[PDB]
Design a protein around this ligand. Structure first.
Ligand SMILES: [Cl-]
Ligand SMILES: [Cl-]
Ligand SMILES: [Cl-]
Ligand SMILES: [Cl-]
Ligand code: NA
Ligand code: NA
Length: 129
């Protein structure tokens, strides 16, 4: 599913991401924009042989099982395919675990390089929330 911007903001808000660990909703929408272009089905292979999955491009080396990342963990206790669903629940629950990890949203490279330090509230402007 390719979400609309405000559609995704509302989904993320209902799932409790607004101000989760102090990260306002626009941070999460911005991250999704530049990680996946709002496409839940996005998959991208990484140089280390892991793969990133879903609307927040969550990685198989640590967070989900894809059966093809030797030595990896599955800290969200899910198949990586669960991160590709049109329903964002699994991605949200896993993202909450990731961001409670020590580095916060710096775990997301697109957030760090394209959202951090910017006017992220622009990503929710105009939306009915
Ligand atoms: Cl915001
Ligand atoms: Cl594996
Ligand atoms: Cl293994
Ligand atoms: Cl949803
Ligand atoms: Na894994
Ligand atoms: Na990445």
């Amino acid at each position: 599913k390719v979400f609309g911007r405000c559609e995704l903001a509302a989904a993320m808000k209902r799932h409790g991401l607004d101000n989760y660990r102090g990260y306002s909703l626009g941070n999460w929408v911005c991250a999704a924009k530049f990680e996946s272009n709002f496409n839940t089905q996005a998959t991208n292979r990484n140089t280390d042989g892991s793969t990133d999955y879903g609307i927040l491009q969550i990685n198989s080396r640590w967070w989900c099982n894809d059966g093809r990342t030797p030595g990896s963990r599955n800290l969200c206790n899910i198949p990586c395919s669960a991160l590709l669903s049109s329903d964002i629940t699994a991605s949200v629950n896993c993202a909450k675990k990731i961001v409670s990890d020590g580095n916060g949203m710096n775990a997301w490279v697109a957030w760090r390089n394209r959202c951090k330090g910017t006017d992220v509230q622009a990503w929710i402007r105009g939306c009915r929330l």
